[PDB]
Curated annotation (Swiss-Prot), chain B:
Outcome of substituting A25D: In strain: Alpha/B.1.1.7
Subunit architecture: Binds to host ACE2. RBD also interacts with the N-linked glycan on 'Asn-90' of ACE2. Cleavage of S generates a polybasic C-terminal sequence on S1 that binds to host Neuropilin-1 (NRP1) and Neuropilin-2 (NRP2) receptors. Interacts with host integrin alpha-5/beta-1 (ITGA5:ITGB1) and with ACE2 in complex with integrin alpha-5/beta-1 (ITGA5:ITGB1). May interact via cytoplasmic c-terminus with M protein. May interact (via N-terminus) with host bilirubin and biliverdin, thereby preventing antibody binding to the SARS-CoV-2 spike NTD via an allosteric mechanism.
Domain of life: Viruses
Annotated organism of origin: Severe acute respiratory syndrome coronavirus 2 (2019-nCoV)
Protein name (record): Spike protein S1
Lineage: Viruses, Riboviria, Orthornavirae, Pisuviricota, Pisoniviricetes
Role summary: Attaches the virion to the cell membrane by interacting with host receptor, initiating the infection. The major receptor is host ACE2. When S2/S2' has been cleaved, binding to the receptor triggers direct fusion at the cell membrane. When S2/S2' has not been cleaved, binding to the receptor results in internalization of the virus by endocytosis using host TFRC and GRM2 and leading to fusion of the virion membrane with the host endosomal membrane. Alternatively, may use NRP1/NRP2 and integrin as entry receptors.
Length: 50, 50
């Protein structure tokens, strides 16, 4: 299929009118970041020559 | 077949025709001994940085 970009909404704009939030949620959301590779070392001499 | 290693005891299920066994690195990891048909484990001999 041709993929959906999302819900094809349109904002109900006007002059002289505004929308104001009456109620709210706290949200908690994960975010994950890597920080380290596995510290690795090669004895190039033993690796090449056994 | 030459090498240097720790010749440990093995439980490895050698099939009747098999002469030796390898790990992924082409490293021969087990041998049927040619004088007595017991199976040796060629465990890695230790090395590290100074
Ligand atoms: C603002 O919207 C009203 C209708 O609500 C319209 O009559 C008026 O012309 C608009 N004025 C401007 C400056 O857009
Ligand atoms: C906000 O939403 C919660 C949902 O449980 C509701 O109980 C509460 O009455 C609402 N508060 C306001 C100020 O609208």
């Amino acid at each position: 299929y041709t993929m959906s970009l999302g819900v094809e909404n349109s904002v109900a704009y006007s002059n002289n009118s505004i929308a104001i939030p009456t109620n709210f949620t706290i949200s908690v959301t994960t975010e994950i970041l890597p920080v380290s590779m596995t510290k690795t070392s090669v004895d190039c001499t033993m690796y090449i020559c056994g | 077949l030459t090498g240097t290693g720790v010749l440990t005891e093995s439980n490895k299920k050698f099939l009747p025709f098999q002469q030796f066994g390898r790990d992924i690195a082409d490293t021969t990891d087990a041998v049927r001994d040619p004088q007595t048909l017991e199976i040796l484990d060629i465990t890695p001999c230790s090395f590290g940085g100074v």
